């Protein structure tokens, strides 16, 4: 059998017995085949419905208990066996099971002892009976329980980012049934940025919260903080969903969505205007975004007809998410909490944003069609259909009840997107996976991302360039090194994926679905330098981490035995020139121009050998994979020699060698050379323009301002005429016009 055999039988008996009572009385016999088709989140709901009409069947109740046993939900599985046993006492084997499970999970309660006594009298002195007697004894005493707790706390003092240890603390709290303390630590720990990124931790967070909601302790205590803990569950769901989608398989991700949707429906009714309501707002967006990402995962593997329909469906999901407004940040109790919520908001807009674009670039105003056709409520049922099995109640599912009102159907603006990315760099702890994705999403766009601003958001007060550039010791790491690194990681990643699909779209993959986009070498380095900088390394591993970084430094700086293809160096050079050429301050201009000249000075020897059609000495285990896809050709050499000579002149100008800089700039009639010629002629004029000074000099001073005006005009004249020149502008066109207005009013 398969999925089709069992879900097609739905229409078989649906067409034979359509009334609700008989439809649910077939649930046990529906669930009979899903247990065989390896569907346990589905089989669970099928049998559970038959139990809603046939609540006195010991077979059905046991079957659910045996299914909750596969789910490892001890509290739920035990209760099911209990019902089957109290209905039918002859089920001896279940009395053993109950006694077996009660002693394995927790012995503190005498209930485990009672069921063990009965299990003994049903199986006199059987081999299992003693086994359970030893198990019940195994559990430690009061002094023993306290002993374990002190270890975890003393262990958590120095290792607060350890996933396993924090999990054990929640389990120890849960073993003493002080769940309030379990959630209390669980809440104070959702502020940890590392734990929030742990798949297994968030899974524990979902359980420990649910356990507390149903727990007797939650009701007795008060209903005031009930809302507070409820927020974390939604937050946990969002994080857990992001992680499950990437690592887990198609089935597990879909199942988590249902838990997400159940929580949303249960939360919307309360509403209000506090942190919980604001949290519901932002998490609502995440739901669709991840749901869209989830949709695209299924279609990737599937055929073309389903792909377009699913991508159409996903496009709507991402759209819904992007539309959702920035959550009300002021409304949260604390600075940490509110800053977190905004961070996630930026993540939502950024991820959904690029997806909305990459899906809309396929066709012309493709977005408009998506809304005009599927914004209809018919789409809401087509979405629930593709995502879930229709058998689940469509009433308590948030997806089916949401009011899809006035979809903006407006593609995102790049400027807004940039500030979303920059604000969300800390969303996923700056995993090189995160950044390499963003960097690639901008690789297809005409505007480039503010990478230098990304790094400033991550490694604060890390100098742009280190004074002690002589050595490769990793205490001298600089934001330039990182910027130069990410450039290669993305330039490398793009080429690798390009080669993959050629053997078999690459931009369209969502962030969770795609696999590692960088080499484990690169990832190890980034994780190392990150742990080092943020001061979350290990005293013992310091020397190792330190050396791991040191190894690659000599390559990021194009020193001895750099594993750098000439094309990657050139890309670094120009990408830094133009990156620096647009900066306002001199410190930054100098640095970025310096590095650009440096890399240039390393390439030109290679280009000369390549200029005569010779062979480049290939590398030994390079850090950045070589590719013949972008191997430099003679057709492009003279351009680089020219483009490099500009970079030389620019640095000469910044250092003071105006005479040599101008002599070079004037040699080549390029759009960029105009903006440089103009910018330096303006400075010689403005300073001398108004001070008391020799009149003849004043006329010469004015003469330069006259040259400035002319060169800016040549820029705009040639710019408006041809589009290719607009892209060559070292700064935006409006910026050129902005100066010109001031230049002439002077």
């Amino acid at each position: 059998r398969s999925k089709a055999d069992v879900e097609r039988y739905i229409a078989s008996v649906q067409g034979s017995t359509p009334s609700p009572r008989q439809k649910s009385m077939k649930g046990f016999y529906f669930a009979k085949l899903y247990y065989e088709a390896k569907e346990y989140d589905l089989a669970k709901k099928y049998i559970c419905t038959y139990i809603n009409v046939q609540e006195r069947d010991p077979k059905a109740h046991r079957f659910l208990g045996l299914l909750y046993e596969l789910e490892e939900n001890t509290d739920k599985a035990v209760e099911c066996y209990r019902r089957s046993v109290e209905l039918n006492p002859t089920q001896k084997d279940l009395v053993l099971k109950i006694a077996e499970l009660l002693c394995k999970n927790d012995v503190t309660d005498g209930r485990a002892k009672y069921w063990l006594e009965r299990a003994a009298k049903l199986f006199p002195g059987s081999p299992a009976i003693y086994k359970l007697k030893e198990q019940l004894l195994d559990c430690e005493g009061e002094d023993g329980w306290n002993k374990l707790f002190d270890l975890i706390q003393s262990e958590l003092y120095v290792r607060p980012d350890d996933v396993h240890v924090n999990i054990r603390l929640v389990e120890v709290y849960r073993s003493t049934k002080r769940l309030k303390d379990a959630v209390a630590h669980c809440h104070e720990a959702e502020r940890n940025i590392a734990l929030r990124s742990s798949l297994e931790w968030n899974s524990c967070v979902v359980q420990t919260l649910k356990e507390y909601l149903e727990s007797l302790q939650c009701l007795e205590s008060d209903k005031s903080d009930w809302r507070a803990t409820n927020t974390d569950l939604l937050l946990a769901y969002a994080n857990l969903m992001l992680l499950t989608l990437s690592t887990r398989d198609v089935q597990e991700s879909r199942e988590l969505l249902q838990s997400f949707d159940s929580a949303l429906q249960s939360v919307k009714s309360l509403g209000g205007n506090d942190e919980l309501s604001a949290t519901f707002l932002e998490m609502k967006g995440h739901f669709y975004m991840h749901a869209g990402s989830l949709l695209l995962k299924m279609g990737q593997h599937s055929s073309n007809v389903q792909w377009r329909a699913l991508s159409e469906l996903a496009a709507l999901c991402y759209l819904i998410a992007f539309q959702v407004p920035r959550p009300k940040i002021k409304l949260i109790k604390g600075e940490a909490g509110q800053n977190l919520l905004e961070m996630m908001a930026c993540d939502r807009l950024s991820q959904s944003g690029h997806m909305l674009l990459n899906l809309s670039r396929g066709k012309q105003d493709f977005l408009k069609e998506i809304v005009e056709t599927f914004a209809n409520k018919s789409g809401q049922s087509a979405l629930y259909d593709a995502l879930f099995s229709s058998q689940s109640p469509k009433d308590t599912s948030f997806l089916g009840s949401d009011d899809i009102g006035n979809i903006d159907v407006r593609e995102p603006e790049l400027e807004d997107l940039t500030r979303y990315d920059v604000g969300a760099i800390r969303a996923h702890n700056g995993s090189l996976q995160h950044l390499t994705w963003l960097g690639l999403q901008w690789n297809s766009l005409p505007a480039l991302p503010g990478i230098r601003k990304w790094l400033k958001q991550l490694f604060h007060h890390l100098p742009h360039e280190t004074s002690r550039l002589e050595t490769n010791a990793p205490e001298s790491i600089c934001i330039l090194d990182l910027e130069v690194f990410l450039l290669g990681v993305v330039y490398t990643s793009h080429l690798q994926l390009k080669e993959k699909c050629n053997s078999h779209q690459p931009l369209c993959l969502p962030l969770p679905v795609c696999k590692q986009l960088c080499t484990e070498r690169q990832k190890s380095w980034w994780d190392a330098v990150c742990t080092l900088i943020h001061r979350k390394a290990v005293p013992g591993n310091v020397a190792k981490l330190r050396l791991l970084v040191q190894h690659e430094i000599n390559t990021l700086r194009a020193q001895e035995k750099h594993g750098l293809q000439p094309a990657l160096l050139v890309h670094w050079a120009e990408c830094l020139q133009k990156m620096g050429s647009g900066l306002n301050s001199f410190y930054d201009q100098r640095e970025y121009m310096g590095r650009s000249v440096h890399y240039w000075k390393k390439v030109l020897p290679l280009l000369k050998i390549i200029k005569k059609k010779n062979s480049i000495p290939e590398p030994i285990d390079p850090l950045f994979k070589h590719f013949h896809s972008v191997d430099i050709q003679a057709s492009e050499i003279v351009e680089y020699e020219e483009d490099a000579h500009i970079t030389f002149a620019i640095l000469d100008a910044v250092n003071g060698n105006i005479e040599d800089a101008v002599t070079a700039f004037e040699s080549i009639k390029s759009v960029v050379s105009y903006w440089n010629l103009a910018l330096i002629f303006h400075r010689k004029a403005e300073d001398i323009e108004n001070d008391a000074l020799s009149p003849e000099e004043q006329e010469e001073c004015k003469n330069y301002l006259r040259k400035t005006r002319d060169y800016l005009i040549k820029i705009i004249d040639d710019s408006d005429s041809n589009l290719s020149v607009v892209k060559k502008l070292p700064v935006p066109l409006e910026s050129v016009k902005e100066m010109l207005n001031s230049v002439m009013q002077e």
Epitope: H461, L532, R535, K536, V538, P539, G540, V542, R546
Partner: antibody, heavy 129, light 108 residues
Framework: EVQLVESGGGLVQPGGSLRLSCAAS????????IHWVRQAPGKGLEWVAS????????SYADSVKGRFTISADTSKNTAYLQMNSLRAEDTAVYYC??????????????????????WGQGTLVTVSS | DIQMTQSPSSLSASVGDRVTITCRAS??????VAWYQQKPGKAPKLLIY???SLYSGVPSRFSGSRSGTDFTLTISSLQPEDFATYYC?????????FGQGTKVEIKR
Amino acid sequence: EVQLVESGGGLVQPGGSLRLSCAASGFNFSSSSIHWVRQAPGKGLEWVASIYSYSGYTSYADSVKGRFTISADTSKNTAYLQMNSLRAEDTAVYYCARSPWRWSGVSDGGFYYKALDYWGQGTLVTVSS
Amino acid sequence: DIQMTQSPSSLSASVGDRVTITCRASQSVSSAVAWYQQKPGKAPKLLIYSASSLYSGVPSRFSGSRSGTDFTLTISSLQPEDFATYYCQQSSSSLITFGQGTKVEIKR
């Protein structure tokens, strides 16, 4: 261009709390170990806290163990000395200082710092009811 | 616990003298000792690190030395600006301890 500035001092009542701030600039705060050293009037130097360079494992003198808490923030490029249950005996001038990773070695049974190169101006803390 | 016993507690000398201060480590300690100069009210400054290595910028008349568990600061020719209090410091496992200090008073 490189300096350490202490702040967050002033007077407080016994059994109260304070928080000192050691703002650093000019050296990569990640690779530096941070220490606090108090000195009562007319008395000598007493080491009270340390933070290993690249990770930040704490270590306090028994005279203040469990009461004080020293921390380091990469984003703010600043270290702090949280002080609780302050006693009249804690009245002293509190200095902070760094020890680069070049001088921070880890050994079986604990770590050692070769010396304290950069020192701060020193912020006064008075504890008297 | 390790203890650095500094001697003498208070010293009196005049300019040009070859002055000596000594600190004894109770337990056998490795060469991870330092020396500091603290002028009245000002901050302590580092003179010698790793027992006998001179901190960059310190005058050449300062020199550190060790013998067994006794560490010794040595000034070849005392100067007027060197009349201040000095301290010795050991760095053992996850612990730092200072000597009681030595005041260098001008003799008359």
